[PDB]
Amino acid sequence: KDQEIKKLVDQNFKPLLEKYDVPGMAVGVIQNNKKYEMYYGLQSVQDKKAVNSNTIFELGSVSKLFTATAGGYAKNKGKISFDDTPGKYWKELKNTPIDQVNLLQLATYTSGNLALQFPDEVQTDQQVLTFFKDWKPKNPIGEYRQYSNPSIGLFGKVVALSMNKPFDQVLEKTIFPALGLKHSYVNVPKTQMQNYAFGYNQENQPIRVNPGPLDAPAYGVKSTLPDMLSFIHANLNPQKYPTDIQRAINETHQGRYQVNTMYQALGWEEFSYPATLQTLLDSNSEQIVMKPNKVTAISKEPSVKMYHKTGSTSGFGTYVVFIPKENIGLVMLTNKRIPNEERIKAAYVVLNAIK
Numbered sequence: 001k002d003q004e005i006k007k008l009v010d011q012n013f014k015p016l017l018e019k020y021d022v023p024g025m026a027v028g029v030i031q032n033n034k035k036y037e038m039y040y041g042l043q044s045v046q047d048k049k050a051v052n053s054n055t056i057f058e059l060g061s062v063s064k065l066f067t068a069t070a071g072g073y074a075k076n077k078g079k080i081s082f083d084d085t086p087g088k089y090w091k092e093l094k095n096t097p098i099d100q101v102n103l104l105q106l107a108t109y110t111s112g113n114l115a116l117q118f119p120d121e122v123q124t125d126q127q128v129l130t131f132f133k134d135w136k137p138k139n140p141i142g143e144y145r146q147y148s149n150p151s152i153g154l155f156g157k158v159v160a161l162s163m164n165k166p167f168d169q170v171l172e173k174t175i176f177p178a179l180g181l182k183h184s185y186v187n188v189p190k191t192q193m194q195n196y197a198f199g200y201n202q203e204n205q206p207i208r209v210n211p212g213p214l215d216a217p218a219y220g221v222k223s224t225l226p227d228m229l230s231f232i233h234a235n236l237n238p239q240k241y242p243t244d245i246q247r248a249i250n251e252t253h254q255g256r257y258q259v260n261t262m263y264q265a266l267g268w269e270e271f272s273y274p275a276t277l278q279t280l281l282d283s284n285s286e287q288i289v290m291k292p293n294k295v296t297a298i299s300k301e302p303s304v305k306m307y308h309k310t311g312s313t314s315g316f317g318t319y320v321v322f323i324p325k326e327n328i329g330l331v332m333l334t335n336k337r338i339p340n341e342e343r344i345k346a347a348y349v350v351l352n353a354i355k
């Protein structure tokens with residue numbers, strides 16, 4: 001049966017390279033603590049350099065999972081409460097309309113007035129602080145989800161202040177080591193630059209992510225396929241990790257609210273398992289990703305859960321999914337974006353075929 005994992009990944013992921021002209025791709029499956037890595041094509045077209053276990057890809061919004069885990073770690077070490085407001089930590093946002101929003105609401109996008117992106121004009125630490133002070137409510141706080149890089153990005157920055165280290169050191173010095181990751185970075189160091197893939201835009205130009213305001217917590221992490229499989233392993237099978245980080249991971253798995261069939265946990269999207277294909281696809285629909293939606297309390301607490309998250313930068317696509325009770329998960333990393341629905345579908349066919 002194990003000798004089917006490669007075949008299935010070949011059948012479902014491999015065709016996407018030709019269909020979308022993707023130079024390179026890494027697909028990982030973990031099943032019953034056993035890892036499978038499938039590499040395709042090139043990390044650099046110009047250099048004729050193959051994707052391999054050393055290839056570093058940009059995770060985009062999948063970084064949000066690390067931010068959430070870092071939040072979970074900080075809560076369980078007593079450094080923050082999800083009930084606190086940013087103003088307790090960012091002394092300067094005190095008494096501003098933002099400081100009626102609590103840390104959970106930010107992490108889970110329900111401030112009621114935050115968009116997918118900051119305005120292009122905002123770049124400096126100084127413009128960031130200004131944006132937040134001037135911020136005013138629109139929807140009743142807590143009531144509406146609009147997916148937002150500023151929302152979780154501020155949560156991210158707050159988690160860092162609470163640990164008295166800049167966000168980058170929180171991940172590189174604390175979170176990544178605890179998860180046993182060897183090649184995951186906020187800032188790819190000089191000795192790894194040769195392992196850093198070019199991303200490729202829709203014009204097949206080589207590109208990498210540009211510095212941006214509160215980028216690290218929102219979409220600024222880079223990682224390898226082995227590291228991401230280790231991250232999924234930790235999610236699937238946490239009891240093995242330091243108690244600190246087991247607690248942090250548990251915290252990211254708890255659903256906070258729903259939007260019909262999608263449960264918002266911390267970073268992760270949660271669903272009842274088995275989920276229909278369209279349930280998974282809907283989490284990534286324009287309605288959900290791009291538009292405000294009123295939430296509801298969790299009514300059905302799913303017995304058996306599965307979790308996913310997509311990620312994108314201008315030249316990179318990412319998807320991660322896991323099902324604890326099947327003890328399986330999948331990671332897809334590309335150095336060109338392909339439609340989210342393509343990622344989700346391919347993963348669905350493979351994980352279903354094995355389990």
Ligand SMILES: *[B@]([O])([C]N1[C]=C([C][N]S(=O)(=O)[C]C(F)(F)F)N=N1)OP([O])([O])=O
Pocket residue numbers: 060061062116149218219289310311312313314
């Ligand atoms: B996250 O990856 C955050 N995200 C994605 C986008 C789409 N813009 S982009 O072209 O992919 C590049 C950018 F991020 F802007 F740098 N904007 N913010 O979100 P998802 O993958 O949708 O969950």
